[PDB]
Protein backbone atom coordinates (compact mmCIF):
# COMPACT_ATOMS: atom_id res chain seq x y z
CA UNK A 1 0.00 0.00 0.00
CA UNK A 2 0.62 3.68 -0.16
CA UNK A 3 0.52 5.40 3.23
CA UNK A 4 2.57 7.93 5.21
CA UNK A 5 5.18 6.40 7.46
CA UNK A 6 4.82 8.90 10.31
CA UNK A 7 2.13 11.38 11.38
CA UNK A 8 2.02 14.23 13.86
CA UNK A 9 -1.56 13.39 14.80
CA UNK A 10 -3.30 10.10 14.22
CA UNK A 11 -6.81 11.47 13.61
CA UNK A 12 -8.04 14.62 11.86
CA UNK A 13 -11.35 16.27 11.27
CA UNK A 14 -13.30 15.61 8.10
CA UNK A 15 -13.50 18.94 6.31
CA UNK A 16 -15.90 19.84 3.54
CA UNK A 17 -14.04 19.50 0.23
CA UNK A 18 -15.25 21.77 -2.57
CA UNK A 19 -14.29 24.00 -5.51
CA UNK A 20 -12.24 23.18 -8.56
CA UNK A 21 -8.49 22.64 -8.51
CA UNK A 22 -6.17 25.64 -8.70
CA UNK A 23 -2.93 23.69 -8.37
CA UNK A 24 -1.55 20.37 -9.48
CA UNK A 25 -3.80 20.73 -12.52
CA UNK A 26 -1.31 20.50 -15.39
CA UNK A 27 0.60 17.69 -17.03
CA UNK A 28 4.18 17.89 -15.76
CA UNK A 29 6.22 14.67 -15.85
CA UNK A 30 4.63 12.86 -18.77
CA UNK A 31 2.61 12.79 -21.96
CA UNK A 32 -0.92 11.70 -21.05
CA UNK A 33 -2.91 12.52 -17.93
CA UNK A 34 -6.04 11.25 -16.19
CA UNK A 35 -7.88 14.31 -14.95
CA UNK A 36 -10.88 13.97 -12.66
CA UNK A 37 -14.25 15.57 -13.29
CA UNK A 38 -15.47 15.53 -9.70
CA UNK A 39 -14.38 16.38 -6.18
CA UNK A 40 -14.12 13.40 -3.87
CA UNK A 41 -11.71 11.13 -2.00
CA UNK A 42 -9.62 8.40 -3.62
CA UNK A 43 -8.47 5.73 -1.24
CA UNK A 44 -4.95 4.40 -1.27
CA UNK A 45 -6.19 1.09 -2.28
CA UNK A 46 -8.17 2.15 -5.29
CA UNK A 47 -5.03 4.11 -6.16
CA UNK A 48 -2.93 0.98 -6.25
CA UNK A 49 -5.65 -0.94 -8.12
CA UNK A 50 -5.58 1.67 -10.88
CA UNK A 51 -1.78 1.61 -10.83
CA UNK A 52 -1.70 -2.15 -11.33
CA UNK A 53 -4.12 -1.81 -14.20
CA UNK A 54 -2.05 0.79 -16.04
CA UNK A 55 1.29 -0.84 -15.38
CA UNK A 56 0.14 -4.29 -16.39
CA UNK A 57 -1.44 -3.00 -19.59
CA UNK A 58 1.82 -1.24 -20.46
CA UNK A 59 4.33 -3.88 -21.60
CA UNK A 60 7.41 -1.96 -20.39
CA UNK A 61 6.60 0.80 -22.88
CA UNK A 62 6.92 3.71 -20.51
CA UNK A 63 6.58 5.14 -17.04
CA UNK A 64 3.65 5.87 -14.74
CA UNK A 65 3.52 8.76 -12.26
CA UNK A 66 1.03 8.91 -9.40
CA UNK A 67 0.22 12.53 -8.59
CA UNK A 68 -1.72 11.95 -5.38
CA UNK A 69 -0.67 10.54 -2.00
CA UNK A 70 -3.42 9.69 0.52
CA UNK A 71 -2.18 11.04 3.89
CA UNK A 72 -5.66 11.48 5.36
CA UNK A 73 -6.88 9.05 8.01
CA UNK A 74 -10.43 7.77 7.80
CA UNK A 75 -11.76 6.70 11.17
CA UNK A 76 -14.59 4.29 11.85
CA UNK A 77 -16.23 3.37 15.12
CA UNK A 78 -16.39 -0.31 16.10
CA UNK A 79 -19.11 -2.39 14.57
CA UNK A 80 -21.89 -2.50 17.10
CA UNK A 81 -21.35 0.50 19.39
CA UNK A 82 -23.37 3.59 20.25
CA UNK A 83 -22.52 7.28 19.78
CA UNK A 84 -20.65 7.75 23.01
CA UNK A 85 -16.93 7.75 23.50
CA UNK A 86 -15.37 9.49 20.52
CA UNK A 87 -13.18 9.32 17.42
CA UNK A 88 -12.90 5.57 17.09
CA UNK A 89 -9.87 4.70 15.03
CA UNK A 90 -8.07 4.87 11.72
CA UNK A 91 -9.28 2.32 9.19
CA UNK A 92 -7.82 3.29 5.80
CA UNK A 93 -6.33 6.29 4.03
CA UNK A 94 -7.93 8.76 1.64
CA UNK A 95 -6.48 11.28 -0.80
CA UNK A 96 -8.31 14.47 -1.78
CA UNK A 97 -9.01 15.18 -5.45
CA UNK A 98 -10.83 18.13 -6.96
CA UNK A 99 -12.27 18.80 -10.38
CA UNK A 100 -9.16 19.30 -12.50
CA UNK A 101 -6.55 17.28 -10.60
CA UNK A 102 -4.23 15.41 -12.93
CA UNK A 103 -4.20 12.37 -10.66
CA UNK A 104 -2.15 10.15 -13.00
CA UNK A 105 0.46 10.65 -15.69
CA UNK A 106 1.96 8.35 -18.33
CA UNK A 107 5.00 8.38 -20.58
CA UNK A 108 6.44 6.46 -23.48
CA UNK A 109 3.69 4.50 -25.18
CA UNK A 110 1.66 5.32 -28.27
CA UNK A 111 -1.41 7.45 -27.70
CA UNK A 112 -3.88 4.67 -28.51
CA UNK A 113 -2.36 2.25 -26.04
CA UNK A 114 -2.18 4.98 -23.41
CA UNK A 115 -5.85 5.82 -23.88
CA UNK A 116 -6.79 2.18 -23.53
CA UNK A 117 -4.67 1.64 -20.44
CA UNK A 118 -5.99 4.75 -18.83
CA UNK A 119 -9.63 3.91 -19.44
CA UNK A 120 -8.69 0.59 -17.86
CA UNK A 121 -7.48 2.60 -14.88
CA UNK A 122 -10.53 4.86 -14.83
CA UNK A 123 -12.71 1.78 -14.55
CA UNK A 124 -11.54 1.34 -10.96
CA UNK A 125 -11.71 4.88 -9.55
CA UNK A 126 -14.83 6.41 -7.92
CA UNK A 127 -14.85 9.63 -9.98
CA UNK A 128 -15.58 10.54 -13.55
CA UNK A 129 -12.36 11.05 -15.47
CA UNK A 130 -11.03 12.44 -18.72
CA UNK A 131 -7.97 11.35 -20.65
CA UNK A 132 -5.96 14.34 -21.85
CA UNK A 133 -3.02 14.57 -24.22
CA UNK A 134 -0.92 17.68 -23.62
CA UNK A 135 -3.26 19.68 -25.90
CA UNK A 136 -0.31 21.95 -26.58
CA UNK A 137 1.99 19.25 -27.97
CA UNK A 138 0.27 17.02 -30.55
CA UNK B 1 -6.36 15.46 -44.95
CA UNK B 2 -6.66 16.31 -48.65
CA UNK B 3 -3.23 17.82 -49.37
CA UNK B 4 -1.59 14.41 -48.84
CA UNK B 5 -4.04 12.76 -51.25
CA UNK B 6 -3.37 15.55 -53.75
CA UNK B 7 0.39 14.97 -53.41
CA UNK B 8 0.12 11.20 -53.87
CA UNK B 9 -2.13 11.69 -56.91
CA UNK B 10 0.27 14.25 -58.36
CA UNK B 11 3.21 11.87 -57.95
CA UNK B 12 1.23 9.07 -59.58
CA UNK B 13 0.28 11.39 -62.45
CA UNK B 14 3.91 12.41 -62.93
CA UNK B 15 5.17 8.82 -63.01
CA UNK B 16 2.41 7.78 -65.41
CA UNK B 17 3.16 10.77 -67.65
CA UNK B 18 6.84 9.82 -67.72
CA UNK B 19 5.88 6.29 -68.79
CA UNK B 20 3.40 7.57 -71.39
CA UNK B 21 5.97 9.98 -72.86
CA UNK B 22 8.64 7.27 -72.91
CA UNK B 23 6.33 4.71 -74.56
CA UNK B 24 5.98 4.94 -78.33
CA UNK B 25 3.08 2.46 -78.41
CA UNK B 26 0.56 1.69 -75.67
CA UNK B 27 -2.15 -0.81 -74.85
CA UNK B 28 -4.67 -1.56 -72.11
CA UNK B 29 -5.49 -5.07 -70.91
CA UNK B 30 -8.41 -6.25 -68.79
CA UNK B 31 -6.74 -8.91 -66.62
CA UNK B 32 -9.61 -9.74 -64.27
CA UNK B 33 -9.01 -13.22 -62.93
CA UNK B 34 -5.37 -13.24 -64.06
CA UNK B 35 -3.76 -15.01 -61.12
CA UNK B 36 -0.75 -13.69 -59.22
CA UNK B 37 1.55 -16.20 -60.92
CA UNK B 38 0.03 -15.55 -64.35
CA UNK B 39 0.45 -11.79 -63.91
CA UNK B 40 4.04 -12.24 -62.74
CA UNK B 41 4.86 -14.40 -65.77
CA UNK B 42 3.15 -11.96 -68.17
CA UNK B 43 5.04 -9.02 -66.66
CA UNK B 44 8.31 -10.98 -66.89
CA UNK B 45 7.63 -11.71 -70.56
CA UNK B 46 6.82 -8.04 -71.20
CA UNK B 47 10.03 -6.97 -69.45
CA UNK B 48 11.98 -9.43 -71.58
CA UNK B 49 10.26 -7.92 -74.63
CA UNK B 50 11.22 -4.44 -73.30
CA UNK B 51 7.65 -3.39 -72.48
CA UNK B 52 6.49 -1.92 -69.17
CA UNK B 53 3.13 -3.19 -67.92
CA UNK B 54 1.55 -1.78 -64.76
CA UNK B 55 -1.82 -0.89 -63.29
CA UNK B 56 -2.78 2.78 -63.67
CA UNK B 57 -5.81 4.50 -62.15
CA UNK B 58 -8.50 4.89 -64.79
CA UNK B 59 -9.40 8.49 -63.96
CA UNK B 60 -5.77 9.61 -63.73
CA UNK B 61 -4.88 7.86 -66.99
CA UNK B 62 -7.88 9.40 -68.77
CA UNK B 63 -7.00 12.89 -67.53
CA UNK B 64 -3.34 12.43 -68.50
CA UNK B 65 -4.27 11.12 -71.96
CA UNK B 66 -6.70 14.00 -72.48
CA UNK B 67 -3.87 16.39 -71.61
CA UNK B 68 -1.42 14.52 -73.86
CA UNK B 69 -3.91 14.39 -76.77
CA UNK B 70 -4.86 10.70 -76.44
CA UNK B 71 -8.41 10.56 -77.83
CA UNK B 72 -9.34 6.95 -77.12
CA UNK B 73 -12.68 5.39 -76.18
CA UNK B 74 -13.20 5.32 -72.41
CA UNK B 75 -14.32 1.69 -72.72
CA UNK B 76 -10.60 0.86 -72.71
CA UNK B 77 -10.34 2.31 -69.19
CA UNK B 78 -13.62 0.63 -68.24
CA UNK B 79 -12.62 -2.48 -66.31
CA UNK B 80 -9.48 -3.10 -64.24
CA UNK B 81 -6.95 -2.36 -66.97
CA UNK B 82 -3.18 -2.68 -66.84
CA UNK B 83 -1.51 -0.19 -69.18
CA UNK B 84 1.44 -1.74 -71.02
CA UNK B 85 3.76 0.59 -72.93
CA UNK B 86 5.78 -1.03 -75.72
CA UNK B 87 8.01 1.20 -77.84
CA UNK B 88 9.93 -1.28 -80.03
CA UNK B 89 8.08 -4.58 -80.62
CA UNK B 90 4.38 -3.81 -80.98
CA UNK B 91 3.94 -7.09 -82.86
CA UNK B 92 5.74 -8.91 -80.04
CA UNK B 93 3.58 -7.23 -77.39
CA UNK B 94 0.40 -8.09 -79.29
CA UNK B 95 1.53 -11.69 -79.79
CA UNK B 96 2.29 -12.00 -76.07
CA UNK B 97 -1.16 -10.58 -75.34
CA UNK B 98 -2.73 -13.15 -77.69
CA UNK B 99 -0.77 -15.96 -76.01
CA UNK B 100 -2.00 -14.74 -72.62
CA UNK B 101 -5.54 -14.58 -74.02
CA UNK B 102 -5.19 -18.20 -75.13
CA UNK B 103 -3.65 -19.43 -71.85
CA UNK B 104 -5.84 -17.30 -69.54
CA UNK B 105 -8.80 -14.90 -69.51
CA UNK B 106 -6.88 -11.67 -70.13
CA UNK B 107 -8.31 -9.48 -72.88
CA UNK B 108 -6.62 -6.71 -74.89
CA UNK B 109 -9.29 -4.07 -74.34
CA UNK B 110 -7.69 -1.11 -76.11
CA UNK B 111 -4.57 -0.20 -78.02
CA UNK B 112 -2.81 2.93 -79.24
CA UNK B 113 -0.07 2.44 -81.84
CA UNK B 114 1.29 5.62 -83.44
CA UNK B 115 -1.60 7.52 -81.90
CA UNK B 116 -4.04 5.14 -83.60
CA UNK B 117 -6.81 3.82 -81.33
CA UNK B 118 -6.72 0.12 -82.20
CA UNK B 119 -10.01 -1.61 -81.38
CA UNK B 120 -10.37 -5.35 -80.75
CA UNK B 121 -10.05 -6.36 -84.41
CA UNK B 122 -7.21 -3.96 -85.23
CA UNK B 123 -5.37 -4.99 -82.06
CA UNK B 124 -5.77 -8.68 -82.87
CA UNK B 125 -4.50 -8.13 -86.41
CA UNK B 126 -1.51 -6.14 -85.15
CA UNK B 127 -0.70 -8.81 -82.55
CA UNK B 128 -0.83 -11.54 -85.19
CA UNK B 129 1.37 -9.35 -87.39
CA UNK B 130 5.11 -10.08 -87.10
CA UNK B 131 8.06 -7.78 -86.38
CA UNK B 132 10.25 -5.76 -88.75
Amino acid sequence: MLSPKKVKYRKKQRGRLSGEAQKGNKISFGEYGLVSLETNFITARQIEAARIAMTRKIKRGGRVWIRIFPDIPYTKKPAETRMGKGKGGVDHWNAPVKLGTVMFEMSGVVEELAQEAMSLASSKLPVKTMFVVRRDLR
Amino acid sequence: MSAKINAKKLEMFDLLKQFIDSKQNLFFLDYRGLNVAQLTELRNKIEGEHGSLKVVKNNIMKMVLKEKNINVVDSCLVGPTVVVTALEEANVIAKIFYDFVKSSTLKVKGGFVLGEFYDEAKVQAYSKLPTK
Binding site: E20, N25, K26, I27, G33, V35, L37, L99, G100, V102, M130, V132, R135, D136, L137, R138 | -
Partner: protein, 181 residues
Protein backbone atom coordinates in the same frame (compact mmCIF):
# COMPACT_ATOMS: atom_id res chain seq x y z
CA UNK C 1 1.87 34.39 -43.33
CA UNK C 2 -1.70 34.99 -42.20
CA UNK C 3 -1.55 31.95 -39.92
CA UNK C 4 0.75 34.06 -37.72
CA UNK C 5 -1.69 37.00 -37.54
CA UNK C 6 -4.33 37.48 -34.85
CA UNK C 7 -7.27 39.90 -34.73
CA UNK C 8 -8.29 41.60 -31.47
CA UNK C 9 -10.26 44.54 -30.23
CA UNK C 10 -9.87 46.63 -27.13
CA UNK C 11 -11.87 45.97 -23.99
CA UNK C 12 -12.68 48.20 -21.04
CA UNK C 13 -14.61 45.80 -18.83
CA UNK C 14 -12.11 44.79 -16.15
CA UNK C 15 -13.98 42.58 -13.75
CA UNK C 16 -14.45 38.94 -12.91
CA UNK C 17 -18.09 39.11 -13.96
CA UNK C 18 -17.14 41.05 -17.08
CA UNK C 19 -14.50 38.50 -18.08
CA UNK C 20 -16.99 35.69 -17.56
CA UNK C 21 -19.45 37.47 -19.83
CA UNK C 22 -16.78 37.89 -22.50
CA UNK C 23 -15.82 34.23 -22.43
CA UNK C 24 -19.51 33.40 -22.67
CA UNK C 25 -19.48 35.47 -25.86
CA UNK C 26 -16.71 33.08 -26.83
CA UNK C 27 -13.71 35.38 -26.67
CA UNK C 28 -10.56 35.41 -24.55
CA UNK C 29 -9.35 38.32 -22.39
CA UNK C 30 -5.73 39.15 -22.91
CA UNK C 31 -3.11 41.69 -21.99
CA UNK C 32 0.05 42.84 -23.75
CA UNK C 33 3.07 44.20 -21.91
CA UNK C 34 6.71 44.85 -22.70
CA UNK C 35 8.99 47.41 -24.30
CA UNK C 36 8.16 49.76 -21.44
CA UNK C 37 4.77 50.59 -22.95
CA UNK C 38 1.51 50.94 -21.10
CA UNK C 39 -0.22 47.58 -20.85
CA UNK C 40 -2.78 47.01 -23.58
CA UNK C 41 -5.99 45.23 -22.63
CA UNK C 42 -7.71 43.45 -25.46
CA UNK C 43 -9.80 40.42 -26.37
CA UNK C 44 -9.30 37.61 -28.86
CA UNK C 45 -11.55 35.28 -30.81
CA UNK C 46 -11.40 31.87 -29.16
CA UNK C 47 -12.22 29.99 -32.36
CA UNK C 48 -9.45 31.79 -34.24
CA UNK C 49 -6.93 31.12 -31.47
CA UNK C 50 -7.86 27.44 -31.27
CA UNK C 51 -7.70 27.02 -35.04
CA UNK C 52 -4.34 28.69 -35.50
CA UNK C 53 -2.25 28.03 -32.37
CA UNK C 54 -3.65 24.76 -31.05
CA UNK C 55 0.00 23.77 -30.48
CA UNK C 56 1.62 26.79 -28.86
CA UNK C 57 4.90 26.53 -26.98
CA UNK C 58 6.93 28.95 -24.89
CA UNK C 59 8.84 29.81 -28.07
CA UNK C 60 5.89 30.57 -30.34
CA UNK C 61 5.91 34.12 -31.65
CA UNK C 62 3.09 35.84 -33.46
CA UNK C 63 1.64 39.12 -34.69
CA UNK C 64 -1.24 41.04 -33.13
CA UNK C 65 -3.16 43.48 -35.31
CA UNK C 66 -5.79 45.76 -33.79
CA UNK C 67 -6.68 47.03 -37.26
CA UNK C 68 -4.47 50.05 -36.61
CA UNK C 69 -1.13 48.68 -35.42
CA UNK C 70 1.04 45.57 -35.49
CA UNK C 71 2.78 43.99 -32.52
CA UNK C 72 5.28 41.13 -32.36
CA UNK C 73 4.48 39.17 -29.20
CA UNK C 74 5.49 35.96 -27.48
CA UNK C 75 2.83 33.88 -25.81
CA UNK C 76 4.21 34.48 -22.34
CA UNK C 77 1.26 32.84 -20.63
CA UNK C 78 -2.12 31.22 -21.16
CA UNK C 79 -4.42 30.23 -18.30
CA UNK C 80 -5.95 26.93 -19.38
CA UNK C 81 -8.64 24.86 -17.71
CA UNK C 82 -7.88 21.28 -18.70
CA UNK C 83 -11.25 19.76 -17.85
CA UNK C 84 -13.25 22.07 -20.11
CA UNK C 85 -10.44 22.76 -22.60
CA UNK C 86 -11.09 26.42 -21.83
CA UNK C 87 -8.60 29.22 -22.23
CA UNK C 88 -9.46 32.03 -19.87
CA UNK C 89 -6.59 34.53 -20.11
CA UNK C 90 -3.59 35.29 -22.33
CA UNK C 91 -0.39 37.18 -21.48
CA UNK C 92 1.54 38.53 -24.48
CA UNK C 93 5.11 39.68 -23.98
CA UNK C 94 6.09 42.16 -26.68
CA UNK C 95 9.56 42.33 -28.18
CA UNK C 96 11.20 44.53 -30.79
CA UNK C 97 10.71 43.03 -34.24
CA UNK C 98 14.23 43.90 -35.42
CA UNK C 99 16.37 43.15 -32.35
CA UNK C 100 18.34 39.93 -32.31
CA UNK C 101 17.54 37.88 -29.23
CA UNK C 102 18.39 34.52 -27.71
CA UNK C 103 16.04 31.72 -26.74
CA UNK C 104 16.29 28.08 -25.71
CA UNK C 105 14.42 25.98 -28.26
CA UNK C 106 13.57 22.29 -27.80
CA UNK C 107 14.67 19.53 -30.13
CA UNK C 108 12.49 16.98 -31.85
CA UNK C 109 13.97 13.55 -32.51
CA UNK C 110 13.00 11.70 -35.68
CA UNK C 111 14.10 8.53 -37.43
CA UNK C 112 15.37 5.24 -36.06
CA UNK C 113 19.12 5.30 -35.49
CA UNK C 114 21.33 2.51 -36.81
CA UNK C 115 23.36 2.43 -33.60
CA UNK C 116 20.31 2.00 -31.38
CA UNK C 117 18.96 -0.49 -33.89
CA UNK C 118 22.17 -2.49 -33.40
CA UNK C 119 22.50 -1.98 -29.64
CA UNK C 120 23.07 1.71 -29.05
CA UNK C 121 22.15 3.58 -25.88
CA UNK C 122 20.16 6.80 -26.19
CA UNK C 123 21.37 9.48 -23.82
CA UNK C 124 19.66 12.80 -24.53
CA UNK C 125 22.26 15.06 -22.95
CA UNK C 126 20.60 18.27 -24.17
CA UNK C 127 16.84 18.74 -24.40
CA UNK C 128 17.17 22.20 -25.96
CA UNK C 129 19.64 24.47 -27.72
CA UNK C 130 20.27 28.20 -27.41
CA UNK C 131 19.58 29.78 -30.78
CA UNK C 132 19.54 33.33 -32.08
CA UNK C 133 17.38 35.14 -34.63
CA UNK C 134 14.99 37.99 -35.08
CA UNK C 135 11.70 37.23 -33.32
CA UNK C 136 9.62 36.47 -36.40
CA UNK C 137 12.08 33.78 -37.53
CA UNK C 138 12.63 31.84 -34.31
CA UNK C 139 12.14 28.10 -34.86
CA UNK C 140 9.33 26.49 -32.91
CA UNK C 141 11.47 23.37 -32.45
CA UNK C 142 14.60 22.11 -34.16
CA UNK C 143 14.50 18.71 -35.84
CA UNK C 144 17.15 16.01 -35.69
CA UNK C 145 17.15 12.69 -37.54
CA UNK C 146 19.14 9.92 -35.86
CA UNK C 147 19.01 7.32 -38.65
CA UNK C 148 22.64 7.72 -39.86
CA UNK C 149 23.91 8.01 -36.27
CA UNK C 150 25.55 4.62 -35.72
CA UNK C 151 26.96 3.10 -32.53
CA UNK C 152 29.35 5.15 -30.43
CA UNK C 153 28.21 8.39 -32.07
CA UNK C 154 27.41 11.76 -30.52
CA UNK C 155 25.58 14.66 -32.15
CA UNK C 156 27.46 17.93 -32.49
CA UNK C 157 25.57 21.19 -32.21
CA UNK C 158 26.75 22.33 -35.65
CA UNK C 159 25.34 19.07 -37.03
CA UNK C 160 21.82 20.38 -36.38
CA UNK C 161 20.51 21.49 -39.76
CA UNK C 162 18.93 24.80 -38.94
CA UNK C 163 16.29 27.06 -40.51
CA UNK C 164 17.47 29.89 -42.71
CA UNK C 165 17.89 32.94 -40.49
CA UNK C 166 18.39 30.94 -37.27
CA UNK C 167 21.86 30.65 -35.80
CA UNK C 168 23.55 28.81 -32.95
CA UNK C 169 24.38 30.74 -29.79
CA UNK C 170 25.89 28.17 -27.41
CA UNK C 171 29.24 29.09 -25.90
CA UNK C 172 30.18 25.40 -26.08
CA UNK C 173 29.72 24.60 -29.76
CA UNK C 174 31.17 21.10 -29.40
CA UNK C 175 28.87 19.85 -26.64
CA UNK C 176 26.81 16.80 -27.60
CA UNK C 177 23.02 16.99 -27.81
CA UNK C 178 22.23 13.27 -27.98
CA UNK C 179 24.69 10.39 -27.75
CA UNK C 180 24.27 6.78 -28.77
CA UNK C 181 26.75 4.54 -26.97
Amino acid sequence: ENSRVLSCQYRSSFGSSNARRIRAKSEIPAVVYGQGKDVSHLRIKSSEFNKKFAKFTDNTVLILDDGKLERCVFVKDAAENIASKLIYHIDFYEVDRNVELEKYVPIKLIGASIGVKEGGILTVLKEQVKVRSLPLDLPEFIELDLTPVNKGDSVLLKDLVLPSNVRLAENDENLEVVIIK
